Ligand binder design. Structure first.
Ligand SMILES: CCOC(=O)c1csc(N2CCN(C3=Nc4ccccc4SC3)CC2)n1
Ligand SMILES: CCOC(=O)c1csc(N2CCN(C3=Nc4ccccc4SC3)CC2)n1
Lengths: 255, 40, 273, 236, 273, 59, 40, 57, 59, 40
């Protein structure tokens, strides 16, 4: 009586149940694991807070309306302030982590709408100015708020044009990245497990984000007659196999 | 025959002949069998 | 290898063509799941689509130019073409760039090839024979200042001398600092409020000072340098969506404003053929 | 001294030749490789992942909406969409498949075309997708369409339908750039019965459509893509 | 091997020289069936009549020309010889063409050879040294537009750079779409009422853009390109009648009107020697 | 570096010589051969089929 | 010795030494013996 | 080859970090004598610092 | 005479390449080596000897 | 393969792979053990 459909994920002191899942994706078919010695470089023993950092943090909720263009969060940024995960983050020189991402959106059998939930490794954004204008730090570190693709261009911020993925590629091809759809008629959640993907064994958690999670409405939300025209979307994310190394004074970052 | 000492100096590599699209085409956690229902 | 097996009528409870794309998988459906097929063999291996093959041919990565002329009274050799540099990068001419950016991280040895041809746009009695000296000059080393500085001694820095009209060829090991040259980088060099973004922060590979070794003849000679790059021993990770809009800058993802629709509009209906 | 003779071609530079060269950095030790998920070995590995087709090409500036094929409730017998199968041009051209095919001169193989339905769960519909092999015109009505490769799709719990365009061909390779002799057919879709919405519901519903290549597929003779060009070298 | 065996007088009921040609056979009659012969050996193998040998020597297949000159103010490089193409085909110079069309289908690898020589028809101080760059550009790829377009980057398209006066040589695998390059084709590309006929429909192989890499000197330089083609690994099917009338067009069988009698008229009688 | 000497004829192009060359299309896979009746191997095979002689050349 | 990797790059092929004119000179359905009458 | 071995807390009478430089020696002290380390390998031979290489171009 | 083809790079001088050359002094006999204390093999050997740092740079 | 007769004409030497800093880092007459007191 197991269905692909019902699932339970327990991680730390927190549990999620979905009764309307559509399997789960594990990026590149690899599950998060700690850093092996053969791959290690820094000689420091690392710190593995385990259950105090590897639990589920639910970010603040978004509201899908008929005019929504899509939202974008960066990792580990989105979690920069969650509990002890965040403290560890500002206090060590280097850290590394994988995540379980669970995006939630329920409706009824009269609604229609379909969101794309995708994880993009190394999502370098484009400046809407063109040329070689850079995208300032603050703009690519929105924190739990994430970036709202239907917000206005700002100065020093990225471009927010959806048919171009914020980088000069077409929305249609985002499907080459680990992703899952939430089609109100099928699905009510999306779950993706992200292994740590980098060109170095461990890195800085503040100067470099290693994935952007993106939720994009593709088939517009259509509510039943005289229904309220909107649904909330909630994102809950859990660091998994986290390791921190090179402890010290506590980083100070712009803004 | 390599005439040179360093590995960078050798010619192109030879075909992976690796080929396994499943990391890209089927990264699902619970295995899906073709023919069985997608969602049970 | 069979490309298609023989398959006949079906009346089952087992439907391989109904799936749920919401899952993120592309189910491996074949012609024989939905029509009646006959056996056929592949006769093919997929040899020429190997990434080593795809990135393994020489591509032009840079065209520069230097001139041989009397430097007498030139206050700025660099500025007169008495010599020129090249802040090594691979993303300045777009053909090879789009190919590499199909991947996120890439690792390979480089083989370069350098063609130099001379031009004599204004009245010369003859064509002189010039020797070029391209110096690999890495980050933290003396920048040549004049076309005949102590720098050109290049006692510790690899340099090649070849003749204009000829070609020079050598290959450089993989020299990225990390395990793989990074194609994209969503980071900064530090948490500064105004530091740059992208890859121009990461991969630093240093210049390449080119100069003519010859002193000047009575006429002036323009030498134009073309650098070709061939990846050998390629390794590529994490495929990405291909580049759709035009490029504006070496190392940022930025596209131009008021660009044009990249998807061709139908001449007719959705229903049109 | 051993006697030699040099042949025609000596001194040429062929960008496609593969030989040894001296290393400029003798004895240098590259950084160790660490493990990174996601390694690609063949472009054939990636063109099997499906991506969305902007089938609804009828707009005037690129929009998220050209990915949506609309469906109308209560129409009978009528046609949902049509397209030829020049995978290197037209709707296909910006898709990952289209985009890679363009790096090669010839292609052969089967294509997989699937449609995922997004209408309310309490609605229902039966569509017919038809592949018309080279030699006939794009079908003009379902009767015409239904006599070639087709699948009646019944919209249900299982949200997507995967149609295969089996390789139908005299010549074993076709050109990726559209060519007549080498042309591959048409793909059309019609109401089999009709879309029906539940009460309290209204308007258009949309289908999303994807394209990917079967394991069947072959691409050969690499060349340059018409999809990218430039007028001056970029700088930093 | 015996070329003739010894044979003596015959008075038989078994007549090998009477046959019925209406049958379509050529009965294998020998000297020894009708005169008295002596033994003799062949001393010969028929080596130099092998089709590999017959089609295996280089033949000139194309002569084109490009010039190096100041492109300043040229509105159409293609039109000024700043560069030129070659819609690859083998049936434009007739010598090799008649040889190939002795067969219906032919399959082979090609080895090309490209000789480039320079001419300076009007007053120059000297002869410059130019490098040619012939680009293989296949159907569906960017057509070069100027002599220095992004196209010439040729990041994915095989190109060779050699010096004028020298020769370039490379060999291309067999690249026909079918199992054998077709010599004749009694068909159309589709059932259109006005579509063309012949082979120009089938075999498409793409251009070859040639250009000089050098910028301009003070004088102008004419470079004339000659492409030679040698078949290697030849396979030929279905022999046909040799070409009798002159050719008029690359890919059609058409002969010129009011052509001349191709059979030499006797100077004398049927009875004449 | 192995010492060599080049002989007279170096650099010449003889249309009849038979040597190896680099392939411009590294790794390309040609179309499979299918069977076709009629293969010719030697011109000596075909000159044994008889054909008509315009003997009456007097026109 | 081939110095190159691809087959197209090898020199000319070597003599068929096949030679069988009968597909061209005697494509008759019922075999004709020299010396026996052509038409019986 | 290990570049660093794994080493944990220490509370000893054996102090490798106190020395007398007046002796003229450079005592071979390592990270693992004064912090807690994890194993890591060298992955490197020191090829390009050989004097033959240094004076050989 | 063995057929050859020369590749791109022929005739170049790369200051970092390592090949054989004819000896200008054929048959000459170098002075014997005697023992000398102090041989260095790697620069890695010497950067492990400590030296003083002008830390007080303020002059 | 050496093509030449004299030893000077051969290419560069090959890595010492000798490496022993103690003549430079620990030339003390009485051996010092790390961890034992420097001056007893
Ligand atoms: C699409 C964006 O990616 C890039 O631009 C990119 C990715 S790797 C790359 N390299 C790394 C290899 N290299 C190098 N050449 C040299 C040439 C001459 C002399 C010394 C070197 S030392 C490294 C060229 C630039 N650049
Ligand atoms: C008598 C009528 O038959 C013909 O004209 C005929 C029959 S086969 C034939 N080829 C096939 C082989 N080829 C080719 N060369 C190239 C040259 C340079 C670069 C790429 C190629 S890719 C194919 C030349 C034309 N043409």
């Amino acid at each position: 009586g197991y269905s692909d459909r019902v699932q339970q994920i327990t991680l730390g002191n927190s549990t999620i149940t979905t009764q309307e899942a559509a399997n789960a994706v594990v990026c590149y078919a690899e599950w998060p694991e700690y850093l092996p010695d053969v791959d290690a470089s820094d000689v420091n023993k690392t710190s593995k807070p385990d259950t105090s950092v590897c639990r589920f943090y639910t970010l603040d909720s978004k509201t899908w309306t008929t005019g929504s263009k899509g939202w974008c969060w960066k990792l580990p940024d989105a979690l920069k302030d969650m509990g002890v995960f965040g403290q560890n983050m500002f206090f060590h020189s280097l850290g590394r982590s994988g995540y379980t991402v669970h995006v939630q959106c329920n409706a009824t059998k009269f609604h229609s709408g379909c969101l794309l939930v995708v994880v993009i490794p190394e999502h370098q954004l484009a400046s809407h100015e063109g040329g070689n204008v850079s995208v300032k730090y603050t703009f690519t570190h929105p924190g739990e708020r994430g970036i709202d693709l239907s917000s206005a261009n700002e100065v020093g911020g990225p471009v927010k044009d959806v048919l171009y993925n914020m980088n000069g590629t077409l929305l249609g091809n985002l499907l080459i990245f680990p992703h899952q759809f939430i089609n109100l008629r099928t699905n009510n959640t999306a779950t993706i497990v992200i292994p740590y993907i980098n060109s170095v064994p461990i890195d800085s958690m503040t100067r470099h984000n290693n994935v952007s999670l993106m939720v994009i409405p593709i088939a517009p939300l259509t509510v039943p007659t005289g229904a309220t025209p909107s649904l909330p979307i909630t994102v809950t994310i859990a660091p998994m196999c986290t390791e921190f190394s090179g402890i010290r004074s506590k980083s100070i970052v712009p803004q | 025959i390599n005439y040179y000492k360093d590995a960078a100096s050798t010619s192109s590599a030879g075909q992976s002949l690796s080929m396994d699209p499943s990391k890209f085409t089927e990264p699902v956690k619970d295995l899906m069998l073709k023919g069985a229902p997608a969602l049970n | 290898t069979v490309a298609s097996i023989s398959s006949g009528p079906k009346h089952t409870q087992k439907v391989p063509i109904l799936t749920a794309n919401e899952t993120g998988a592309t189910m491996p459906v074949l012609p024989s799941d939905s029509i009646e097929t006959r056996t056929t063999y592949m006769h093919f291996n997929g040899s020429e689509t190997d990434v080593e093959c795809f990135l393994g041919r020489a591509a032009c990565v840079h065209v520069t130019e230097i001139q041989n002329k009397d430097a007498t009274g030139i206050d700025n050799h660099r500025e007169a073409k008495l010599f020129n540099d090249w802040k090594i990068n691979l993303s300045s001419l777009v053909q090879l760039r789009k190919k590499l950016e199909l991947f996120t991280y890439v690792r390979f040895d480089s083989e370069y090839t350098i063609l130099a041809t001379a031009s004599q746009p204004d009245s010369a009695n003859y064509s002189s024979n010039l020797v070029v000296q391209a110096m690999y000059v890495p980050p933290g080393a003396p920048n040549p200042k004049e076309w005949d500085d102590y720098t050109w001694q290049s006692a510790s820095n690899p340099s090649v001398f070849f003749k204009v009209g000829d070609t020079s060829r050598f290959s450089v090991p993989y020299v990225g600092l990390a395990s793989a040259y990074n194609c994209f980088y969503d980071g900064y060099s530090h948490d500064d409020a105004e530091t740059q973004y992208g890859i121009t922060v990461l991969n630093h590979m240093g210049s390449m000072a080119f100069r003519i070794v010859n002193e000047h003849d009575e006429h002036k000679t323009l030498v134009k340098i073309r650098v070709y790059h061939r990846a050998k021993h390629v390794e590529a990770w994490i495929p990405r969506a291909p580049r759709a809009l035009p490029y504006t800058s070496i190392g940022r993802t930025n596209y131009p404003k008021n660009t044009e629709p990249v998807i061709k509009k139908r001449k007719g209906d959705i229903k049109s053929y | 001294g051993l006697p030699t003779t040099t042949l025609p071609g000596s001194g040429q530079f062929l960008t496609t030749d593969d030989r040894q060269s001296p290393s400029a950095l003798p004895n240098y030790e590259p950084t160790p490789r660490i493990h990174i998920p996601g390694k690609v070995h063949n472009l054939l590995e990636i063109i099997q992942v499906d991506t969305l087709i902007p089938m609804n090409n009828t707009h005037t500036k690129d929009e998220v909406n050209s990915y949506l094929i609309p469906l109308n409730a209560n129409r009978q017998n009528e046609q949902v969409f049509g397209t030829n199968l020049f995978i290197g041009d037209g709707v296909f051209k910006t898709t990952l498949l289209g985009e890679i095919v363009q790096y090669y001169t010839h292609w052969s193989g089967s294509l997989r075309f699937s449609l995922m339905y997004t209408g309310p769960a309490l609605s229902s519909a039966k569509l017919i997708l038809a592949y018309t092999p080279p030699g006939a015109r794009g079908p003009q009505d379902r009767r015409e369409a239904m006599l070639g490769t087709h699948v009646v799709w019944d919209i249900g719990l299982q949200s997507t339908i995967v149609m295969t365009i089996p390789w139908t061909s005299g010549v074993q390779f076709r050109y990726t750039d559209p060519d007549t002799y080498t042309s591959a057919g048409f793909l059309s879709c019609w109401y089999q019965t009709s879309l029906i919405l539940p009460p309290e519901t209204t308007g258009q519903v949309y289908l999303l459509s994807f394209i990917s290549a079967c394991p069947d597929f072959k691409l050969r003779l690499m060349k340059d893509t018409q999809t990218i060009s430039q007028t001056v070298a970029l700088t930093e």
